[PDB]
Structure 1
């Protein structure tokens, strides 16, 4: 029904020129400052308050609360596109994942061929190279729902519930992108994980191993892969 390029421009516009007087009355760009902070890798989570979005685009807040997973992706796309122009220095590579991102970026530049059109599969998945994560803070105009009454009519919608936490698992690594290396080629293979289970890949799909028609068995490894801190809780009605 709607055009997501225009929605991405809308969310870019919101992120770039929304301001508030939070800093002791001084007018700050609430989200541009954070784009700076997480372009320099000093911040991971960006909590996009939807009350701020509603100040100037309540239709956008309605669209967000009605799909809420398309728009989390859109907001992540938009912030990922805005980060390069908010970067005012060079990240200190505080992490080990950062080294993998930097090496992948540098290799991509090195073999660029800017005008050559590469295959849709011959690219880094977005999730592999983000390092930030974007979350919504529900509009206060949404009254909290009761756990019993969150049903199939609210699948895909952003809802707010409250209850007692009864049970929390331990924090453990959830695979987001499974990275493989091959025994023939030297390319990496990426398998973004959406399901609760996945079948690990066997053969590599890289260009060289297709040209050579070689075996090209690929090996799943934790070192280049993307994990996220994962935790499952049970929450209960008041």
Structure 2
């Protein structure tokens, strides 16, 4: 099936370079190492997993570069336009630049360290003439974009019925009431299969609501020996991510006269899970996305959340004033005679 192609006004090589430049340079200098590299040292210590990017930081960096007389190609517009792809770009930049840990971890206790060390040892045994992994497997953190402040489309809180099809791919922000919340369930980022007949594990990344499991060992260890070994899934070695779904509905006041209240599925992943509960009235930033059902199913990949909603010394302020029972009783509904 041949495909046509077109030229477009973007370049992900140039923007990848811009993203890593931002990452290794920026700090919140108006408040006077880089914010993001320091935060990635916290990630390297395994003290943090929620990597938050502020679009305001990107905007400040763009303004700093433009002030220094070079065009920054408006990365804010690009991430507000095709947000999902720039998750991949930002994560690749982090994986290419994150510094080593400082705090001790007891590194062998993670199965991924042992299994990838064993694969490296095996690959060195091969490499004496006698990627190592898909990066999502090793990537422990979760990356989220946080919207622009008032000062731009990501900043505006849309009601659900204003979310039209032209917004698909954009990092929009929605407003409504959560009518339902799912229980948490795990979802596979990367499946790890053992191979029975050679022990060389193999990996499948999953990027859809369904997949088909592997059967035959595709590794060179088996394939060169034409040994049709069988693959078995391991939950120990597979990377899971926490998944949860929530149904958001527009506010009852926003419903036009006679219309049914419109609603949307929000999907939330990683550490951002269980930030929402039913009956919450909330603003949520996310990528508005299609899903396989020409009519597509659709959902919002959540990224950032804004909910709408000492003492034992301070009690002495009333105790010292005296007759507190009589006064506190008189403070019960003072508007009632």
Task: Provide TM-score, normalisation by structure 2.
Answer: 0.62
**SS in structure 1 at match of 2:186:** strand
How much has 1:3 moved relative to structure 2?
Answer: 2.5
Unpaired segments of 5 or more residues in structure 1?
117-121
1:78 correspondence with 2:93: yes
1:212 alignment counterpart: 225
Question: Deviations 1:38-75 (Å, cap 9, x if unpaired)?
Answer: 01111001110001101132710001111001111101
Distance in 2, Cα, partners of 1:95 & 1:64: 37
**SS in structure 1 at match of 2:173:** coil
**SS in structure 2 at match of 1:19:** coil
How much has 1:95 moved relative to structure 2?
Answer: 9.5
**SS in structure 2 at match of 1:54:** helix
Distance in 2, Cα, partners of 1:6 & 1:53: 16
2:113 alignment counterpart: 102
The answer to which of 217-226 and 53-62 deviates more is 53-62
2:241 alignment counterpart: 228
Q: Does the 8 A contact of 1:127 with 1:177 survive in 2?
A: yes
Question: Deviations 1:192-213 (Å, cap 9, x if unpaired)?
Answer: 1111111111111011211222
Task: Provide TM-score, normalisation by structure 1.
Answer: 0.86
Distance in 1, Cα, partners of 2:121 & 2:192: 21
How much has 1:34 moved relative to structure 2?
Answer: 0.4
Distance in 1, Cα, partners of 2:123 & 2:41: 27
Unpaired segments of 5 or more residues in structure 2?
1-7, 63-71, 252-337
2:58 alignment counterpart: 53
Q: Within 5 Å, which residues of 2 pair with 1:16-35?
A: 16-20=24-28, 27=32, 29-35=34-40
**SS in structure 1 at match of 2:174:** coil
1:123 correspondence with 2:138: no
- Alpha-carbon RMSD: 2.2
Question: Deviations 1:120-165 (Å, cap 9, x if unpaired)?
Answer: xx63111111001110001233312221121221111110001111
- Bigger radius of gyration: 2
Q: Does the 8 A contact of 1:21 with 1:28 survive in 2?
A: no
2:141 alignment counterpart: 132
How much has 1:90 moved relative to structure 2?
Answer: 5.9
Question: Deviations 1:68-102 (Å, cap 9, x if unpaired)?
Answer: 0111110111111111xx22536504896xx2331
Whose RCO is larger (CA < 8 A, sep 6+)? 1
Q: Does the 8 A contact of 2:120 with 2:132 survive in 1?
A: no
Distance in 1, Cα, partners of 2:91 & 2:83: 12
1:180 alignment counterpart: 193
Question: Deviations 1:183-234 (Å, cap 9, x if unpaired)?
Answer: 1111111111111111111111011211222220100121110111111111
Distance in 2, Cα, partners of 1:202 & 1:30: 45
